[PDB]
Design a protein around this ligand. Sequence first.
Ligand code: CL
Length: 293
Amino acid sequence: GIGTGFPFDPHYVEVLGERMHYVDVGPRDGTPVLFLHGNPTSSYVWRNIIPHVAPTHRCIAPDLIGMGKSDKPDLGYFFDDHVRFMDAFIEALGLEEVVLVIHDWGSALGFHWAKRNPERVKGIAFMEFIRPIPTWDEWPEFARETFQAFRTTDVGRKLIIDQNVFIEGTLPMGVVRPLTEVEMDHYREPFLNPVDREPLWRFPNELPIAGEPANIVALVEEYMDWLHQSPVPKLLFWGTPGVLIPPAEAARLAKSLPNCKAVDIGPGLNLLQEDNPDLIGSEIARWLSTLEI
Ligand SMILES: [Cl-]
């Protein structure tokens, strides 16, 4: 079925004194497509979408600082930490104009960068992105208790850091189809050492849920407003029931956002890339052929 291997040559770039691993494939002459993963994934999540796009466009898929095959310094791994490291990563590869393909926390990165560099973003494909969740009722009920547990300095760290629940439990619960043992091992590899699991816990404590953290809420609201006011070509993927984006919200945004094409990928939760990579890749490639890049 959905291939579990990772047939990509490892690329490394030094960013603020640390090395960041990244996938780099495709032609070098045009505009490149930058793939940003989230929590608790790596560039491995893009492994079955990239081969659809590589024939025609450059694919760049970094592992976030502290995750995947990137270096893992002793940082707090707040959202701002990733913002600094991703700005410096984009400048280290001398990328001028890019097309964004962003998911989960990568979306919060991508969108934020796009707000600060409007002339440099030729297109944004996004899925299960970070939006402001006004109350806990807008969070899916089946996960509502668990993320509330995750957002505590005592119980949450025992779950995510000591017992590694975000990798062993939450991650498969974010995919409709079952993850194979090879896939689980690939996702487990960067966090075999518990001390390296700080990012797995800080991200859910950065989620803009119920107005906290206030700075993250403001930051996210700002680029959501910028998105509602930008003419950038937009491609939005959504699934049922979803996690961050329920179908109702996706439908709303499909009309409220300028130049927005929506694509229903079928059953999905949060890692839509794992439930229907074929459709996402084919749609991204066809969408890319319609841009002026
Ligand atoms: Cl999270």
